[PDB]
Amino acid sequence: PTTLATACKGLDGREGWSHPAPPAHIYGNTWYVGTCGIASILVTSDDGHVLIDSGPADAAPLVLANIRKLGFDPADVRWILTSHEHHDHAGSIAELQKATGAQIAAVASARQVLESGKPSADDPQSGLIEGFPPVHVARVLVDGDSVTLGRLALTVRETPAHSPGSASWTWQACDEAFTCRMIAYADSATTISADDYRFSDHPDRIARIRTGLSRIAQLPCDILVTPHPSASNLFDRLSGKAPLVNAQACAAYSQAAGSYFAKRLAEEAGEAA
């Protein structure tokens, strides 16, 4: 009787990223096991589990504990996946992997950063953002691929709105009464950069953004979940304060991110004196 929502009140910002949160149940075989600021998703089967995102570089033990505190063995997670290739979300993929033995799978657009720890030359945020400890990508994926673990099937989309390597994930979950819902772990969708960076000068990046917004908006999406919980109002929805199921969430979320992006392009235009 503790609640993610009240347990993390006021910790949406930086203070929360490495700040411990009680694990929670999202739906069916899917569990929140991240911190107050950064999500980490556990997807369970008898055949083994899948885990998405590590949280910041120092957060490995926090989520390792949230796993056990739920009655699951971290030795049972067979795959570690990622939303996108920034330290706050993947910063301890490495430590999380050797503490678990899992293999790592990722979209090709992310592989280079993941295997080097340095953000991509195409990332609007380098070299503002910092790096994290590298990892070897065992299975490198293409848009529409499926990570399969027994009857588990997590299917990935390249969604490059926020970074070049951004990925969004989708899978089915069913409650105790065999009501089934599609969960969408839709990546951060914010178009943000270092100061000197201009999207107008990078048509590749702009075209990839449009592709990502379009794919995010069309994900099968009964239950939206975001690498930053507040981006999808996740703690209130998990804590009965707001509706957990809303099949229109991904569309609205993408529409909003796209609205933000257009304001940013307009700002860059009006800097053309």
Find the shortest distance in angstroms from Cβ 84 to Zn ion: 5
| In the complex, least distance from residue 129 CB atom to Zn ion, rounded to whole angstroms | 7
**Six-digit token pair at 243?**
């509706």
Q: Could you say whether residue 88 binds Zn ion (CB under 5 A)? A: yes
Is 88 annotated in the active site? yes
Annotated catalytic residue within 19, 49, 87, 162 = 162
Active-site residue, 86 included: yes
**Contact (CB, 8 A) for 51 and 81:** yes
For the record, the structure tokens of 49 come out as 């589990």
Residue 49 annotated among the catalytic residues of the structure: no
Query: What is the rounded distance in angstroms from the CA atom of residue 199 to the CA atom of residue 181?
Result: 36
How far apart CA 120 and CA 205 sit, in angstroms, is 12
Residue 204 is among the residues annotated as catalytic for this protein:
no
The response to whether 162 counts as a known ligand-binding position is yes
Could you confirm whether 136 is annotated as catalytic? no
Strands (E), 22-161: 24-27, 30-32, 41-43, 49-52, 77-81, 103-107, 139-141, 146-149, 152-158
The catalytic position among 87, 89, 187, 253 is 89
The answer to whether 89 is a known catalytic residue is yes
Q: Which stretch binds Zn ion (CB under 5 A): 26-34, 86-94, 95-103, 142-150?
A: 86-94
Residue closer to Zn ion by CB (options 104, 113) is 113
Of 19, 49, 88, 185, the active-site residue reads 88
For Zn ion, the closer of residues 88 and 222 by Cβ is 88
Neighbours of 14 (CB within 10 A): 11
When asked if residue 86 is in the footprint of Zn ion (CB under 5 A), the reply is yes
Q: 49-87 burial, b for 16+ CB within 10 Å, e for fewer?
A: bbbbbbbbbebbebbbebbeebebebebbbbbbbbbbbb
Task: Indicate if 202 belongs to the active site.
Answer: no
Q: Which of 19, 49, 87, 228 is catalytic?
A: 228
Point out the catalytic residue in the list 84, 185, 222, 253: 84
Binding track, positions 32-71, relative to Zn ion; x by CB under 5 A: ----------------------------------------
User: For the chain, percent helix, then strand, then coil, each to nearest 5?
Assistant: 30, 20, 50
Given a contact cutoff of 8 angstroms between Cβ atoms, the answer to whether 242 and 233 are in contact is yes
87 near Zn ion (CB under 5 A)? no
Annotated binding-site residues read 84, 86, 88-89, 162, 228
Catalytic residues: 84, 86, 88-89, 162, 197, 228
Binding site for Zn ion (CB under 5 A): 86, 88
- As annotated, the binding site for Zn(2+) includes 84, 86, 88-89, 162, 228
